[PDB]
């Protein structure tokens with residue numbers, strides 16, 4: 001239905017007047033779960049593609065960008081992250097990146113939709129390999145609700161959500177950020193999908209402003225990824241540790257570590273550069289008017 | 290091995306969809322508010338439309354060249370990366386740049402005394418003046434000498450003549466094909482003065498890493514210093530594009546601008562993308578591209 005004449009087209013009122021389309025090789029899955037519409041297809045040139053409510057979540061070809069950054073930005077900004085919470089991350093990709101750190105002993109994942117877990121294991125095996133980690137404790141539920149049952153529990157919280165629509169709506173609210181503050185340990189750090197500086201600079205400054213009322217350290221970084229709207233996405237980074245410097249990794253990686261972790265996107269120079277914004281965005285977020 | 294092909298420019302159900310064999314299996318579509326121009330010149334097919342959300346859009350042989358909303362990224366970077374990597378650029382050559390936007394950025398440098406542009410297609414110049422006035426304003430500078438012709442042939446005519454050469458081209462296709470060839474890079478080397486620098490549209494690291502590496506290899510046999518930088522721009526394929534940078538000066542360090550700009554200079558030049566930090570970060574590539582371009586195998 002979103003597939004016509006051998007192409008899938010992604011449209012959304014959050015990025016009006018533009019669309020990415022990916023040519024379809026083979027439909028793999030299309031079924032509605034309790035929470036959302038779940039579409040999976042083998043594309044011609046991007047490998048397998050997961051689509052939720054018409055919005056591309058990942059492709060095999062470029063997923064490593066978002067997966068490595070959302071994991072390593074917060075992890076390399078904590079001097080010893082031992083207990084990690086992931087909210088969302090149904091494809092298993094973030095889990096896969098997180099567990100590569102020896103410091104990490106325990107990762108709890110809270111995913112709302114078990115059908116996403118199932119189709120990922122089947123059609124996104126290079127990402128859902130994450131689910132086979134001995135470091136994982138898996139919960140099926142609303143992350144916003146699960147956050148309330150945890151206080152002072154986590155070194156790092158990662159919110160790997162789709163856009164501020166449907167089941168992910170509340171994950172972008174100031175109330176949810178308060179819940180994360182409470183679920184973090186006294187020196188804990190968070191990283192949430194924070195949207196696109198070429199599309200949502202208003203949301204970005206607004207989130208930044210409310211986060212600054214909750215946390216001593218707030219930062220915005222971004223990464224490039226062909227199949228997200230406008231070809232990139234950002235991350236909201238917050239710490240309860242007043243000493244956190246997100247822009248200079250507290251855990252730099254050697255070239256050998258980058259090689260051993262099989263990283264395709266992230267390294268310490270990339271981490272530094274991710275905070276260097278286009279002048280329009282730097283000005284909007286930092287300068288006074 | 291075959292020649293590259295793009296889908297012929299067409300508007301269908303109120304959307305323009307860009308397709309090309311240089312980025313197979315993916316497409317950007319922009320919703321159309323108003324069709325403004327669609328005619329073939331003596332060189333190429335020219336589509337101009339007013340989009341719903343990106344202002345006016347220039348399309349050449351089915352390939353998006355610019356949109357009013359995001360043009361400043363490519364325009365500012367292709368201009369300032371070489372200019373701020375030269376201690377005193379006085380004489381500038383632009384090949385292509387029919388929309389006039391690169392001219393607009395180059396002339397903001399007081400050091401720049403003369404800009405020569407060689408653009409092949411007189412019709413692009415006219416549609417840009419009408420439909421892209423914020424870019425085509427570049428044409429109304431007294432610093433400009435304009436030629437209409439093929440930039441490859443034009444390059445043969447100049448020796449030891451320019452501090453900076455910018456090739457602001459579309460893709461290695463149609464009239465632009467020769468602009469990506471080693472023989473063209475040799476011609477530019479000759480057209481540059483002894484310590485001159487060049488910057489060319491150098492394609493996308495998420496799409497064209499093969500071409501990027503190949504160009505890099507042949508440029509390293511010609512110039513002491515060769516680099517690759519990229520900028521983000523939502524309406525080029527995969528949301529970004531890069532730049533080939535070469536210098537005949539062995540002392541040139543492209544990542545560290547030899548001409549840093551103060552915040553005041555950035556304000557004075559009305560820059561919306563480029564600044565000296567952005568300059569530095571634009572050479573920091575994702576691990577896969579850093580590896581492909583720098584590690585020996």
Ligand SMILES: CSC[C@H]1O[C@@H](n2cnc3c(N)ncnc32)[C@H](O)[C@@H]1O
Nearest residue numbers: 057088089090112113142143167168
């Ligand atoms: C594919 S990565 C994004 C994941 O976030 C999940 N998700 C969306 N909303 C919520 C929520 N409120 N709590 C937990 N997970 C969510 C989706 O089901 C998806 O698998």
Ligand SMILES: CSC[C@H]1O[C@@H](n2cnc3c(N)ncnc32)[C@H](O)[C@@H]1O
Nearest residue numbers: 385386387409410413439440464465
């Ligand atoms: C819109 S910016 C790119 C410009 O490059 C121009 N162009 C393409 N091939 C050549 C060439 N061989 N010499 C000069 N300009 C060219 C196109 O006509 C376009 O206006």
Ligand SMILES: [Mg+2]
Nearest residue numbers: 253254255256
């Ligand atoms: Mg090292």
Ligand SMILES: [Mg+2]
Nearest residue numbers: 452482484485
């Ligand atoms: Mg010179």
Ligand SMILES: [Mg+2]
Nearest residue numbers: 550551552553
């Ligand atoms: Mg200053």
